[PDB]
Design a protein around this nucleic acid. Structure first.
Lengths: 49, 195, 49, 122
DNA sequence: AGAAAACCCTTTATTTGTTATATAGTATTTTATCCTC
DNA sequence: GAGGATAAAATACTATATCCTGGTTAAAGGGTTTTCT
RNA sequence: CCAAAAGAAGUCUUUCUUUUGGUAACCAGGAU
């Protein structure tokens, strides 16, 4: 549930930051963190901490 | 999900299977999917040829114009040096003033030369990168990509992240790759065949 | 670490030695040692020996 | 047009706007700490302004119409400065900062259009 | 209307940086250097 | 002198018998809300 | 599958009906 909650939170934040309009830097940062959340959900610790 | 995301099983696990499907080393695939570099997903290689001859002409024009402006600046600096010499020889001022003004003048001349060389080098890098642009090419150095997309925004499309890999897979026919690999197996030998 | 990071985000002449020290990490370390460790164990009391 | 006016204003003021990522709720705290460290560390000739855009939205929570002050960009701060070896450390070492947000690897400066779009009272 | 003591949320950040008791086996990427043309 | 091909080293992942019982399960900080005066 | 309450029959205490209520992971220590 914790790993799913992290994914949902990051996805909601990215989804809200796209409709609101934002520079490309911030959107890409949110996308990178979303990418890292799903990696932790599927295999925690295979890449990074 | 609001953005595409890759599966870690087919990216990380050794051997990397996305890096075999697309022929990308894992070290730089990790750059693409974690927003640490751009990737060229598509390029127009005939529209290039034509507008490439044309843009070679245009780039030569631009370089010559910038160089001429810098040469005019150097000529103005030379006039300043002549005025300095006039000051020197006109009234009485020994080694101190002469050496000071000449050091200043030569420093300024060399700085102008360096500026010219550096700007020419930047434009040369732009041209060189554009002419040899190919798909699956990693454009690190953001400013290089920004200049390229601004100057020649057409002739190529480049993306970043997992959507770039999605677009790479979309524009990927699986039969030509297989036939090429079979030919290399039949002929290559060595590490090429073992790869 | 906390003290020297906090020494730069407080205006001088309001600093007193009590406003730089944060004792919580110290007491946390002791609790971690005496509760969670492979050398801190429940005394063996099957018999006096 | 307020957009044009702020464009003209921000055109002259020195520095380039960068983005800094913090621990979610550490935005006003990070701004205060950075504005204090800018004086304590004597890097005040490189760091010029710290902005945390916010806007007020009326919500009827529990049937109660209240204009709560949200944050436009949650978790990000806007800093105007000239990036160097000392300014970068003075910012990146503020307690509560996760690091700079850049394009590829190194810090990237926003365009005046984007910063105007968020420093304009919503 | 302001102040104090109890809620609700976040996150263990990830640097131009806080982490050193296994061996045995295989497999895959560097890489360095040597050999050739 | 330059390019390619082959040793070398360097990292990356995988495995290491069966059964039983006992003690613990988050902290810390920020912002906010609600009640009391 | 069990507990409690109420109603009916008999036995002196069972049956029928209705309602409500109903686990893991870590670390550690042992044995053969």
């Amino acid at each position: 549930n914790d790993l799913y909650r992290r994914v949902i939170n990051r996805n909601n934040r990215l989804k809200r930051l796209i409709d609101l309009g934002a520079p490309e830097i911030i959107v890409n940062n949110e996308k990178r963190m979303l990418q890292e959340s799903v990696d932790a959900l599927f295999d925690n610790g295979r890449r990074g901490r | 999900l609001a953005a595409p995301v890759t599966h870690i099983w087919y990216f990380k696990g050794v051997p990397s299977r996305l890096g075999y499907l697309l022929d990308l080393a894992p070290k730089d695939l990790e750059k693409i999917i974690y927003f640490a570099a751009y990737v060229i997903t598509s390029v127009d290689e005939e529209m290039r040829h034509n507008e490439l001859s044309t843009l070679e002409a245009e780039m030569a024009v631009e370089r010559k114009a910038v160089e001429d402006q810098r040469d005019g600046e150097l000529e103005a600096r030379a006039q300043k040096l002549e005025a300095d010499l006039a000051e020197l020889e006109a009234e009485g001022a020994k080694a101190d003033a002469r050496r000071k003004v000449r050091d200043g003048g030569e420093r300024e001349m060399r700085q102008i030369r360096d500026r010219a060389q550096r700007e020419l080098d930047r434009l040369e890098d732009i041209w060189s990168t554009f002419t040899k642009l190919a798909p699956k090419q990693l454009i690190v150095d953001e400013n290089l990509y920004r200049e390229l997309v601004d100057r020649y925004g057409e002739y190529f499309t480049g993306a970043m992240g997992a959507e770039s890999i999605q677009k790479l897979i979309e524009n990927f026919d699986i039969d030509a790759e297989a036939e090429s690999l079979r030919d290399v197996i039949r002929n290559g030998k060595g590490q090429k065949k073992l790869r | 670490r906390v003290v020297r990071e906090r020494m730069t985000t407080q205006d001088v002449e309001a600093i007193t030695p009590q406003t730089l020290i944060n004792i919580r990490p110290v007491v946390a370390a002791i609790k971690e040692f005496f509760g969670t460790s492979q050398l801190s164990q429940f005394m063996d009391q099957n018999n006096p020996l | 047009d307020p957009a044009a006016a702020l464009k003209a204003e921000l055109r002259s003021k020195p520095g380039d706007w960068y983005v800094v990522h913090s621990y979610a709720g550490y935005e006003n705290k990070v701004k205060a700490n950075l504005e204090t460290r800018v004086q304590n560390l004597d890097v005040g000739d490189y760091i010029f302004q710290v902005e945390v855009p916010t806007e007020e939205v009326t919500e009827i929570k529990n049937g109660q119409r209240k204009q709560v002050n949200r944050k436009v960009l949650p978790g990000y701060i806007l800093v105007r400065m000239d990036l160097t070896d000392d300014s970068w450390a003075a910012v990146r070492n503020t307690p509560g900062v996760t690091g700079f947000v850049g394009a590829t690897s190194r810090p990237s400066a926003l365009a005046l259009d984007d910063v105007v779009k968020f420093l304009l009272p919503r």
